[PDB]
Design a protein around this ligand. Structure first.
Ligand code: NO2
Ligand code: NO2
Lengths: 143, 140, 140, 143
């Protein structure tokens, strides 16, 4: 992900403000609600028969944490996402068989969650830098 | 296919947007142009800089078209026929670009309606925008 | 939206396929499973090896569903309702997979109908398959 | 594109049989017919108001040749598509602003043209190897 210094600036500043215990669970939760096929990789996680169900569901929040955990990593290694996400690639691709389009969706949901949490602070330029990041991360996962 | 729940969610959310409709449309466009620069090639004759009267003007048209579709959610094909003809035939808009603009419209709403943008409302708006996009790409 | 020209093209092509419908369906599936291995995860309980009676059997069902949609091209939503309910709700099929199967069905037809698969017929079948896919993904 | 030896075998054997003067024009022609938005990058090429028009149109055939020309290259350099297509990337991306999804479409149209020309010879395994190739080429162009 070829971020400019100002793109890095925008991503980093906002990201330090992120509650890493909650945002990940919100993003994953919203994915399973908005794009229900995605529930298919998570039938082991329990009750997903409603939004409130999905949202207020501990296995969802738990896993979201890791997901967001992994994303923060990629944020530190912007100049090397392929290497960073080499392990996770061969998991979702070789082990789980998830289509790459779904990574794009998670990234976009994440972006919607950031917008939701930060409101006016999530400006168009700030959004644009974050789209570059999620795109880079999705591609690295797809590799 | 929109459910009775989706339909009320979308109405509710548009109710909450109220008179900011035009303004949010313009902001959605700017988000799209910045995040997805290939979209700009459909507007070579606009100034796309921040505060552009043409972007503002266009966001209002886009927001009005969306409200018209909410207002006639049950017969969108007919309501949106002239617009789908414009976008598919004359403009040749790549269908992928509808996903991008839809996303930026959701981002915009999320950024402006903290209480209203619940997971259920998010899902309903996503479906509504997808249905609008389907109509707008139906005439190839 | 299918035009009167598309509709005749699709009928024509299905006319030319004739009684090979089932066989081509099975071949389309094998093409899909080999070219796009992630699709196989929806059929963990099938044997997907070449010559599999289950694949053959399934290709016939898929081809019959397609013929039923051609036969009722003007009211596909109703015709395909039970199937869209199965695919969206129970099976949770990723919408992307419809593009993959549609592609393999076109490849299959191209491979079997040299005279019939003209550019115009290609375009019409692509639209028909996309419309079928839209219906089959309409119930999320 | 990580082709196995048998995947390379299948791709190479069939490709030597390809009429490079015609297939490229057929693929590009079909793209503009089946996916009409794509005509937008080719309004300079003349009459595109019908299939017969597009198909029997010299600027189409001409350009298709190059396209297929470029593809044959990538076929020789399967182990290095990024490097091979470095120049063409910064063209369709930086100069022309074409969405990557459209490369996927061209690749699939090409595959349909190969199936059309080779019939039974374009077996499921042969198709699978060719999907790997067009995917790799599309990605390299997207980079
Ligand atoms: O920006 N939609 O015209
Ligand atoms: O393979 N379609 O069920």
């Amino acid at each position: 992900v070829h971020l400019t210094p100002e793109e890095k600036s925008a991503v980093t500043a906002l990201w330090g403000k992120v509650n890493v215990d909650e945002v990940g669970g919100e993003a994953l939760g919203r994915l399973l609600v908005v794009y229900p096929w995605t529930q298919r990789f998570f039938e082991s996680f329990g009750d997903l028969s409603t939004p409130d169900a999905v949202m207020g569901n501990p296995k969802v929040k738990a896993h979201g944490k890791k997901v967001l955990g992994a994303f923060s990593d990629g944020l530190a290694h912007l100049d090397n996402l392929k290497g960073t996400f080499a392990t996770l690639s061969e998991l979702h691709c070789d082990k789980l068989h998830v289509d790459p389009e779904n990574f794009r969706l998670l990234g976009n949901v994440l972006v919607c969650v950031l917008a939701h949490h930060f409101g006016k602070e999530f400006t168009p330029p700030v959004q644009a830098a974050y789209q570059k990041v999620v795109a880079g991360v999705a591609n690295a996962l797809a590799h | 296919v929109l459910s009775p729940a989706d339909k009320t969610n979308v109405k509710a959310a548009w109710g909450k947007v109220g008179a900011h409709a035009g303004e949010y449309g313009a902001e959605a466009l700017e988000r799209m142009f910045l995040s997805f620069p290939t979209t700009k090639t459909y507007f070579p004759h606009f100034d796309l800089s921040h505060g552009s009267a043409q972007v503002k003007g266009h966001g209002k048209k886009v927001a009005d078209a969306l409200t018209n579709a909410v207002a006639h959610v049950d017969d969108m094909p007919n309501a949106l026929s002239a617009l789908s003809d414009l976008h598919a035939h004359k403009l040749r808009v790549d269908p992928v670009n509808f996903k991008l603009l839809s996303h930026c419209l959701l981002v915009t709403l999320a950024a402006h309606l903290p209480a209203e943008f619940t997971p259920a409302v998010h899902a309903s708006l996503d479906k509504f925008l997808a249905s609008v996009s389907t109509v707008l790409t139906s005439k190839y």
